[PDB]
Each structure stands twice: as C-alpha cells, then as structure tokens.
C-alpha cells in the first residue's frame, strides 16, 4: 500500500516545471519563471528555489492535486526528488560546458572529478549532498494548513505545516556539519560520511579493501577542505 516508483514522480515534477507559466504584462508572450530560476542556479546567480504548492495545486496539469497532496503528506522525501529533477534539468541546460568554480569546495570537486577521469562511478563514489549544491524550499497560502503552536500534535509529524507568530529568542549563525570527508594515511583513499540530525560518530579504521587485506592499520584523518558546512 505504498508507492516507490520514483521515476514516474520525477516525470510529473519535471512536467510541472516545464508547463507552469504567467502571461507577460504587455501580452507579448509567456514567462516560465521556475525554469528561469533553474537556469539562474545553473549559471550560479542563485542558491535556492522557493516553490509554492498552491501553484502546483491550481496548475492545468494531470495528477496535479495528487502531486500536491503527496508533497504535503511526505515533504521530507519529496525534497530529494525535487533536487534530483532540478539536477537533471541543470545538466540538460548546461550540456558539455562546466559551471564556474567560486569556492574551495567547487575547486576541490572540479579538480577531483577530472583526477578521477585521469555516471555509475560518480554516483557510487560521491554522495548526492556533495554532488548537488543548492537548496529547495516549499510554501503554502491556503488556510487548510494554518495552525497555531498549540495545535501541532502527533498527526503532524512528517507533514508540511504553516503558522504565524512572534520571535522571542534567536541565536547567531554557526557552522553546521553536513558531510565529513576523511583520508587514509597509508593507502590514500577517501571516506565520505553524510550527517543527519544533531550527532555523528566518526569511523576509526580504514575500510578500503587493499588496506584491510594488507593489514596496514592506516588511520583516518578528517579534512575540512572537502567537508561541507552550512549556515
């Protein structure tokens, strides 16, 4: 009684990005603003897309209501599918060109992918949080999702919720770990560990098969030029 065919859902999501439009104010044509924002990410003038679920709900597309309900009911999963479809759209726009290097992690990734050269290998070697470098956020305006702090209870876990309130306390911005990278002493291999939640446990012993078979006992040392941080 569950659906896990991700390719069909990706097809639906990409059809939304292709076919949502707004008419030009002079009547000269149509704007396709979501794919314009995707191309802004592709040329690196941007870092995030904010998607309005009510636009999906009121779009002139088959299965639009079902897609909106699925997004609202399991939002923590559909973020991954939106990131995957935007990554495929970025590669279709970009072609054989390269996106510009702007920071040390971009320089490390662009240098290391061609060191590896000198899709199965890419997706097995690198986690998707490191391969994809943009943010996706959702919004709602319909009053069905309006609630108070008092009303958010056990039925709302995992769902998208909207509310309105006053800010009492706020901290300053801190660096938060997203992906750690370790390198072995003896065999010079690398380990990538993605982090979820507010804790992580670092691995100790090298997992690479040649190092393990040789019993070289190489330690793992963490490196922050390859590791990923977020505000």
């Amino acid at each position: 009684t569950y659906n896990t065919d991700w390719a069909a859902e990706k097809t639906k999501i990409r059809s939304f990005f292709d076919e949502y439009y707004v008419d030009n104010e002079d009547g000269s044509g149509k704007a396709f603003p979501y794919r314009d924002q995707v191309f802004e990410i592709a040329r690196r003038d941007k870092q995030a897309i904010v998607v309005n679920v009510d636009h999906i709900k009121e779009s002139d597309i088959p299965d639009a209501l079902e897609l909106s309900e699925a997004i609202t009911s399991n939002t923590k999963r559909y973020e991954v599918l939106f990131k995957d479809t935007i990554s495929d759209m970025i590669q279709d726009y970009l072609g054989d060109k390269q996106a510009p290097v702007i920071d040390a992690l971009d320089a490390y990734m662009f240098q290391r992918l061609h060191m590896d050269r000198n899709l199965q290998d890419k997706r097995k070697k690198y986690p998707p949080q490191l391969l994809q470098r943009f943010e996706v956020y959702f919004t709602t305006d319909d009053a069905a999702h309006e609630t108070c702090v008092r009303n958010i209870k056990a039925t709302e876990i995992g769902h998208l919720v909207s509310m309105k309130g006053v800010v009492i306390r706020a901290t300053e911005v801190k660096p938060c770990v997203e992906v750690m990278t370790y390198t072995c002493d003896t065999c010079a291999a690398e380990v990538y560990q993605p982090v979820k939640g507010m804790q992580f446990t670092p691995p100790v012993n090298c997992p690479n098969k040649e190092c393990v078979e040789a019993k070289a006992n190489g330690r793992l040392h963490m490196q922050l030029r390859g590791s990923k941080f977020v505000k």
Binding site: T183, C184, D185, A188, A189, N208, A216, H221
Partner: protein
Amino acid sequence: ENHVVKETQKRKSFSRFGGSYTIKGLKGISANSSQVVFKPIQNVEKHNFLDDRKAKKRAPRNRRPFEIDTNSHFASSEVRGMLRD
C-alpha cells in the same frame, strides 16, 4: 654545552601550523593514488613512509643474544694499591 645545544636544536625543530600535502610522483597502495602527508615536510626526501609507527619483529625467546654481567668498577686508589701488593 651538550645540554644547551641539544635543547636549542629540539626547540628550533618545531613548526607552527599544519595542512596536508600530496607528493606528486610517488604511488600509493590503492589504485590511481599519490602519496599523502599530514605535516609540513621540508623536502620530499625527509618522508619516511611512517616507519615510526610499525612494531618491530622479535626473535623467539630461545634465540635472543645474552650478555654475562660481572660487577666491574674502578675502585679507589687505596683498594687498588692493596690489591697490587
């Protein structure tokens, strides 16, 4: 003079910050890999392949060399004169 020279050499050996470096041209154990070091090496010939870590192999207990110890000392002039006589 030995103590002063040794201490100044040792305290002049240390270096401040860190980093990590690749020795391009030396192969690693795993495939397509170059050697990697985690201290600011002066020159490539100073590299040691971490032989300081590795535990030395021992001979079995039946086959190790052994000395025989005689308590031997340079006694005082009094005792040496008496023994010479």
